[PDB]
Symmetry: D2
Subunit: 327 residues, 4 copies
Amino acid sequence: ADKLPNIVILATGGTIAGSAATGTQTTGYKAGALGVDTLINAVPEVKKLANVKGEQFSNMASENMTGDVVLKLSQRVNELLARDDVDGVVITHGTDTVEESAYFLHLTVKSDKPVVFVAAMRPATAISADGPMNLLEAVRVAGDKQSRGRGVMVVINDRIGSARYITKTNASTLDTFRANEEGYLGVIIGNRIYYQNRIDKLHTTRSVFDVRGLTSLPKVDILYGYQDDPEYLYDAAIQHGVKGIVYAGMGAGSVSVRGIAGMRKALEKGVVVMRSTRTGNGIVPPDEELPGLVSDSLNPAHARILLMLALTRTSDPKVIQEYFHTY
Amino acid sequence: ADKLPNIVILATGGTIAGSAATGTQTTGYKAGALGVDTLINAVPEVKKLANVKGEQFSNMASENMTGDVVLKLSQRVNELLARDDVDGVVITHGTDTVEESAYFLHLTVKSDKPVVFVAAMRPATAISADGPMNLLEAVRVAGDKQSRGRGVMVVINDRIGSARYITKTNASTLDTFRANEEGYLGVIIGNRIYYQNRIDKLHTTRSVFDVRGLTSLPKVDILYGYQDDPEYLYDAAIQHGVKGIVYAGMGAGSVSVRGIAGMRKALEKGVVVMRSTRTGNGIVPPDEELPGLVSDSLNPAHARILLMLALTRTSDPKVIQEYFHTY
Amino acid sequence: ADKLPNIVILATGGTIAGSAATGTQTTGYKAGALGVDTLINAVPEVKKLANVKGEQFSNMASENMTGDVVLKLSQRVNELLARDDVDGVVITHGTDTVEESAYFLHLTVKSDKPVVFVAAMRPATAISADGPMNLLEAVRVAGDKQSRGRGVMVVINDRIGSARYITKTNASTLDTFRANEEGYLGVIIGNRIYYQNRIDKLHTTRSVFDVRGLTSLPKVDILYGYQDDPEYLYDAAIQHGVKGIVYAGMGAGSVSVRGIAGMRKALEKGVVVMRSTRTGNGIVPPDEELPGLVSDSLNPAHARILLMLALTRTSDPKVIQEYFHTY
Amino acid sequence: ADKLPNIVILATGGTIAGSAATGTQTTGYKAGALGVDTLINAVPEVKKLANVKGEQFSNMASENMTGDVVLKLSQRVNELLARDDVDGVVITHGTDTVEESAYFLHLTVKSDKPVVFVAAMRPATAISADGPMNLLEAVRVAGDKQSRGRGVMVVINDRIGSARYITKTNASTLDTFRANEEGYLGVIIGNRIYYQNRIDKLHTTRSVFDVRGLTSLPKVDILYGYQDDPEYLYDAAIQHGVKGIVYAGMGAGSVSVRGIAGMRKALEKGVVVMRSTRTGNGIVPPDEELPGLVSDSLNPAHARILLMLALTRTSDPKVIQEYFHTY
């Protein structure tokens, strides 16, 4: 029959559910202070777009989001997407680490039904808050049949970005989420969805990563690259038992003599080293003369997520590298 | 003017002086392989723009550029610019940490005479190498009377950027140097300079940072911010006598519970904590509820440079914070 | 008491004063539907930033804004700013042609006091409308002492842009106003203004353009450049008495054999030809082999404004060309 | 044979074949001054990538490229791709109108073999000429198996862009070709191709536009939108037999009272009016209150191309509108 699609709104917190003393206060707010019900009733317009059910998964600032919690989130979403009574899901999340949580599910959700992450740069109590409209757009995207099989998406500021390329580029602006080199999957203007691209990477239903029946993930830390970068930080990470290290290198994953010494100690202890870049965009090309693997176009935050997942399936450097060139 | 300006080209290495086997080889090249006079000979046209004098300062990949060497570089430039027969200086440098070295001199050179950093993204032996034209443009800028009193500049890909805003945004493209929110100071088109902006920040002749006689600088490290970031990294830093820590935080310098724990410790040990952002662009706003100071619009790399210089003359947070809003 | 500045809000119309049936409507609304006092009572917080006075100059969609009206707007603003009891002016305007009106005042307002144009991409009745925050920020900018002598500004989406460089780059998004190559003058984050640049161009008090006493402006049209562009469009413009033709050319003001024949007819008939570009950004360089003058980095819309004003003072091509390189 | 792919390089002219008096001459050169054999011999490295055959289709500046010539270019490419011995085609073209010629073929080439347009912003005789590397990259893309079925591509400055989205955004820089909202299809770094997106639009083999046997195309002109735009330009176009009019309007295709009057006249004369935008990016949404059709995300230059082709199929408004949402 012809009816509204069933959409589940899984809330986890963030500024979209945050609040402040006044409406002119755009900073210094308490993220995750509003229930999913509060948000839904704020935009009753969504009712006209679909049959929505709110579910409070958690209510925290995204900076406190952890791998174990994200792992649980992926499992719950897989549970929901399995039901014939669920057409898609919308996940309210904080903007700070949404690219990390979104990319994790992008790789582990075994369904082509739309999984849409939504966020807000201004608190719900702010003048001209962006949450209401973003939420409304997220629902329209999750309920549209065109949205299936496109991988996990992030909806905000009228844009639809792929979890694989989208990233928070600005610390405090509404238009912070961009994919400089890759663009948006589509845009929402005048309540109409305009799809532009389909990412040419593996994801969701065609991903080899399955975290169902998984308690925890391999430990992976991120080290920065800069003039005078200390060798002792590598020592600290190795000692606390990291399984992998993502290096946010200078330029195209360039390493100083101190970083090179630190990386070899790591390779010696069976620790996998992934060279990425601190620049923000671009491809870190292969270089047989430098230690470790290369992150392709994945930024540090994204690389870590994929490295953690890769280690749950293999230790083979050659296999992990290809993962980074295809996911 | 009838008189050709006197320009000193100070070479330090980089890909602009990089060499590879084939012309099609753009990666895995040997940085700092060619001498300064060899670059000048490769572009004889520069001799028509000014009376150039090449001086080899060093010849290494910029990833290995260290604070003590940058310190000496700044003292050498101050030295030359004091001479009445030197109108401008052009410094060939690697692209990887040029934004760090450039910003340092931007704060320590006590002259209004042009100081121009030039670099290249493709080795000198590559097909369509960008170095030749970048060098020619840099000399033109350094020899132009209009270029005085604009602060330290970085010339590349026909663009003129301020050392305070410019950054390498892409790991491998020729158009990698950009200032998304601040734009360029000017552009060079058709052998003509078009100046567009003047930065509204303190620098050079108006800076309080005097580095005469110094041989070393305060130790400052950078820690990344992400999901599951470890507290032990802060312990390690503190244990190795750092004077300040620059945090490349999630979003607007947001800190996780673990990060906050580590920061409290650092603060107790008298370590200065500067909260910046990993996003790439934007303002990290003040927040009395969170620990440490804020980096204004300075990214991690630039933040570290200003913090090191600030610590050479003060440890009072109120004063350091002010520096970050004015420099 | 020693406090609040005096700001006059001149309303001309625009979507910022536009209204639709429901909040779900962001298109198909009516610009210039709400009164100025209605906009003020809508954002009472503005009254805690300054002593505001509202004035209804007009109420129309900006696509209908005309030279004669912009001329009067300029004259009215000059009278207003001459008073000792007026510290600055905020002008609400539609987004479609605000860059034209804003640049006109940029060249004709003879005062250092702040002139801030503000607009909105969404109608006042829309969910997550941007008008309120935009207006609040415009008033804060106009009332700040640091804002004097920076030229006419356009405030929207937390950004402050110069009328000389800013332009609407996207047809429907909130972050449409950008200056790709020149950046923003500053940004407003967390109720604080962060100035970054000062434009290196003549404007306001250093401008030679005086429109006081003027009642009409020279006719100037814009013709597009593209494959198979018709010569007859030039004949039509000439026949209708245009004094100047702004050419939104292909690439760097390149002309086809048909456009060249057209420009030559124009020149032979006393019409001043200005070659700009349809690309959207950059420098159209001088070319001794092509007819007409070049627009520097002025886009077609801005170039038309300057050419119109230039013609009220001279018809000397040498002088007009110099205007384009300095304003 | 040789196991190397067979690539035909079809030369049409352009700066990539441009020649200037001096090496410092990046402007004021002669587009289409060299032959196809000279280009191939200039960069013999291409012969290591594939067995190349050169063909001088023409040699002109792209500003002079006309529809009748593009028509023949399309027909010629179709017969070349029909052969067993042709794996891909590389077309050298001036940058000024490459987006127009490229989009035309994008819609009319009935093959899935790669069709790659390549150009250069600096003349062949310029210091750091970009042409050599651009060509080398174009040949690599055209010969790669991953490249088929991606639609027509434009390769330049290490980027691979789709003919439907790419556009010349800057008048004189090397990094001028961008697709702000849609990103690039892929990038070439270290002699390796990294594909990012597949466009979600109809093209090539799935296009209903066939130009076999056609010698002429319907006439379509472009009119600009700005304050005080004249109605007489519409009358002029109508009087000269245009079948279509593309309007590069203000904002989201906004029209002034004069533009509307002119548009209504054209419609009553059977002229198809297509409202696009002068802004440079974005969606022109549908609007019942305004006359004519909307261009979706196509800019004026692209819109003209699709409208001409649509008119070779039908004049029905609803069908043409659908073409604009799917191509």
